[PDB]
Amino acid sequence: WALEDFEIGRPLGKGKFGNVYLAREKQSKFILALKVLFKAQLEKAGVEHQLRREVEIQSHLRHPNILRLYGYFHDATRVYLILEYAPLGTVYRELQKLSKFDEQRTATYITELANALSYCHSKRVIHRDIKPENLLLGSAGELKIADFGWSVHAPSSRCGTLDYLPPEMIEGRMHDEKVDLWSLGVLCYEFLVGKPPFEANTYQETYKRISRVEFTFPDFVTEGARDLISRLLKHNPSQRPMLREVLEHPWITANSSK
Ligand SMILES: CN1CCN(C(=O)c2cc(Nc3ncc4cc(C(N)=O)n(C5CCCC5)c4n3)cn2C)CC1
Ligand SMILES: [Mg+2]
């Protein structure tokens, strides 16, 4: 693959390490998203193994709720990821659009997330990073996890606006699959309320709020949601439900679709 090969369209998203662009493949007329990262800035920040964790993992996972990486190439200056395109954009933009979600949309995304994370954890891979700006919508409004790296494998290991990160990760202790489960809780909450439960005004404050696990529920939050989120947001990782217990949880089934 090479640049010429594609016509590039409008830009889809901001320069993390470069932008991502809508794009069309000349031969087949295939519409895709082209993540464009300048080598310069990767090396300067030394995250090439993160890139080289996004690539391997996203190409070898195949699941309807995981964004697909089709291939890559580089030139002199830049590395190019060829991604699946998610026509309806991010859950982040949708949340900004509606401010909060209803229970049906929420339970439905939590379910699509739980299956995608279920597949993920079966191959021992853990995402570590399911913010809403990494959740994308397909053409049917199907939720799709993207990004990857930072990432996966076994127990582990290694500025991430803190919000979705669990206590063990924040202190630097040892973590497993359960990190994602806590994130599901932060997400669940965020969807219903419109703001993540440890949202604070400063990194340092947020860090307190997470380590202490201090959040409260606005009054409009139904008994069963609290039940799911309360259960998901425990300090001790091993007292966090497994995904099949989430997928069960009476509230999810009272509200999800399928
Ligand atoms: C109708 N509308 C929904 C879609 N709209 C969008 O502009 C849009 C589409 C997409 N699609 C898309 N597809 C694959 C992606 C892979 C990525 C990625 N970088 O992993 N992104 C990002 C670009 C910025 C946020 C997410 C992707 N975005 C992002 N945006 C911001 C506009 C409003
Ligand atoms: Mg992101």
Swiss-Prot record:
What is the official name of this protein in its record? Answer: Aurora kinase A
Coiled coil feature spans = none
Q: Where in the cell is it found?
A: Cytoplasm, Cytoskeleton, Microtubule organizing center, Centrosome; Cytoplasm, Cytoskeleton, Spindle pole; Cytoplasm, Cytoskeleton, Microtubule organizing center, Centrosome, Centriole; Cell projection, Neuron projection
Underlying gene: AURKA
Q: Where is this region: Activation segment?
A: 153-162
- What reaction gets catalysed by this protein? L-seryl-[protein] + ATP = O-phospho-L-seryl-[protein] + ADP + H(+); L-threonyl-[protein] + ATP = O-phospho-L-threonyl-[protein] + ADP + H(+)
UniProt crosslink position (Glycyl lysine isopeptide (Lys-Gly) (interchain with G-Cter in SUMO2)): K131
Which residues does the annotation say bind ATP? K16, K35, E84, Y85, A86, E133, N134, D147
State the EC number(s): 2.7.11.1
What's this protein's family per the entry? Belongs to the protein kinase superfamily. Ser/Thr protein kinase family. Aurora subfamily.
* Domain named Protein kinase: residues: 6-252
Q: How does it assemble?
A: Part of a complex composed of NEDD9, AURKA and CTTN; within the complex NEDD9 acts as a scaffold protein and is required for complex formation. Identified in a complex with AUNIP and NIN. Interacts with FBXL7. Interacts with CPEB1, JTB, TACC1, TPX2, PPP2CA, as well as with the protein phosphatase type 1 (PP1) isoforms PPP1CA, PPP1CB and PPP1CC. Also interacts with its substrates ARHGEF2, BORA, KIF2A, PARD3, and p53/TP53. Interaction with BORA promotes phosphorylation of PLK1. Interacts with CIMAP3. Interacts with GADD45A, competing with its oligomerization.
The enzyme's main class, written as a single word, is transferase
Mutating V47M: effect? Answer: In a metastatic melanoma sample; somatic mutation; constitutively enhanced kinase activity
Q: Mutating D147N leads to what result?
A: Abolishes cilia disassembly and kinase activity
Effect caused by changing Y203A: Reduces binding to MYCN
Another remark in the UniProt entry says: Centrosome amplification can occur when the cycles are uncoupled, and this amplification is associated with cancer and with an increase in the levels of chromosomal instability.
| Impact after mutating K35R | Loss of kinase activity
Spell out the activity regulation: Activation of CDK1, appears to be an upstream event of AURKA activation. Phosphatase inhibitor-2 (PPP1R2) and TPX2 act also as activators. Inactivated by the G2 checkpoint. Inhibited by GADD45A and p53/TP53, and through dephosphorylation by protein phosphatase type 1 (PP1). MLN8054 is also a potent and selective inhibitor. Activated during the early phase of cilia disassembly in the presence of CIMAP3. Inhibited by the small molecule inhibitor VX-680.
